[PDB]
Amino acid sequence: MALLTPDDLININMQLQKADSAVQEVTGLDIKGICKALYGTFSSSEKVGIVPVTSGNGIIGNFSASLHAITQYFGFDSFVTDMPDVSGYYEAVQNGAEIILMADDRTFLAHNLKNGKMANNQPCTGIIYAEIASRYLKADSKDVLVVGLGKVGFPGAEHLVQKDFRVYGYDADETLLERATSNLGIIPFDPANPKKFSIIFEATPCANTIPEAVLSENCVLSTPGIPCAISEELRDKYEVQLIAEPLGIGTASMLYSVL
Numbered sequence: 690m691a692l693l694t695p696d697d698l699i700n701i702n703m704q705l706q707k708a709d710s711a712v713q714e715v716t717g718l719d720i721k722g723i724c725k726a727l728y729g730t731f732s733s734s735e736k737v738g739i740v741p742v743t744s745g746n747g748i749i750g751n752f753s754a755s756l757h758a759i760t761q762y763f764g765f766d767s768f769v770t771d772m773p774d775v776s777g778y779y780e781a782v783q784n785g786a787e788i789i790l791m792a793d794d795r796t797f798l799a800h801n802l803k804n805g806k807m808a809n810n811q812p813c814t815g816i817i818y819a820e821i822a823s824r825y826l827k828a829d830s831k832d833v834l835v836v837g838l839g840k841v842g843f844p845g846a847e848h849l850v851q852k853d854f855r856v857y858g859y860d861a862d863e864t865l866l867e868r869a870t871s872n873l874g875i876i877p878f879d880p881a882n883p884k885k886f887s888i889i890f891e892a893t894p895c896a897n898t899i900p901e902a903v904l905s906e907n908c909v910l911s912t913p914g915i916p917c918a919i920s921e922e923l924r925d926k927y928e929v930q931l932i933a934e935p936l937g938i939g940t941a942s943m944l945y946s947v948l
């Protein structure tokens with residue numbers, strides 16, 4: 690279970706600002722602009738109730754506080770309930786929450802009580818990070834490499850295929866790889882004979898998943914994964930334009946997806 694740790698969420702504002710500027714530099718739009726382009730929707734400072742959950746491994750330090758800052762950053766009227774779990778859910782609804790935002794170890798959801806729409810963090814994160822990669826201004830071809838085809842990677846790959854991109858996929862689990870290639874029609878990437886990419890989407894909980902033989906100078910690496918798919922040196926060597934942020938972007942995707 691590759692879950693957030695409290696230290697991933699240290700000064701979430703500075704992380705989200707730098708990611709926002711990176712998205713601006715890469716796509717020409719900010720995270721808000723991406724969300725608008727994706728869902729055709731906009732914020733109206735909605736009231737979102739953040740409910741801490743003690744289920745499974747329990748409350749993660751900085752989690753509900755980071756969600757508060759993220760929602761505030763995107764101009765939402767958010768609050769964290771005093772009580773957790775069902776008691777916290779009750780408090781949220783009582784205090785006039787329009788969107789409930791809550792997570793256990795397997796599901797992080799956003800539920801708009803007004804319109805009945807509900808978002809899952811995994812597909813929402815996959816779609817937005819793939820969307821950002823796809824909107825790279827300085828891309829010469831529609832070739833996109835996807836590494837990691839799990840709960841985040843598969844929806845992201847699907848989104849790229851549906852946008853008529855040439856999608857190359859790899860996953861260390863070949864069951865998931867062969868199940869992805871048949872269901873999506875993606876070209877199975879072979880690391881034995883690689884090619885260079887200008888657009889790369891990685892959704893893996895591991896480091897060093899993107900080899901040097903895959904990189905081209907100024908390429909885009911869009912990755913929600915923790916830690917970093919590429920080494921510090923390989924990032925400098927190829928001046929890789931990096932889109933990586935622990936919570937805010939995927940949360941923005943969830944919120945705008947239910948508006």
Ligand SMILES: NC(=O)C1=CN([C@@H]2O[C@H](COP(=O)(O)OP(=O)(O)OC[C@H]3O[C@@H](n4cnc5c(N)ncnc54)[C@H](O)[C@@H]3O)[C@@H](O)[C@H]2O)C=CC1
Pocket residue numbers: 691692693810811814836837838839840841842859860861862865892893894895898912913914915934935936937938939940
């Ligand atoms: N930054 C954000 O906003 C968010 C980040 N995440 C992170 O994204 C990552 C992926 O999440 P999920 O897709 O739910 O996990 P998952 O386990 O469903 O998918 C990960 C996939 O990557 C594959 N993989 C692992 N190591 C690999 C390697 N060395 N080479 C190729 N493939 C490899 C696995 O076989 C698996 O299919 C996790 O690290 C998670 O913490 C998740 C949600 C939001």
Ligand SMILES: NCCC[C@@H](N)C(=O)NCCCC[C@H](N)C(=O)O
Pocket residue numbers: 691692693740741742743744747748749750752753792793794795797810935936939
């Ligand atoms: N990466 C974006 C966050 C989704 C997921 N990767 C995760 O860490 N889920 C665990 C969250 C558990 C929250 C906890 N129950 C709390 O309320 O603090």
Ligand SMILES: [Mg+2]
Pocket residue numbers: 814913934935936937938939940
């Ligand atoms: Mg994110």
Ligand code: NA
Pocket residue numbers: 891892893894895896898912914915916917918
């Ligand atoms: Na990774």
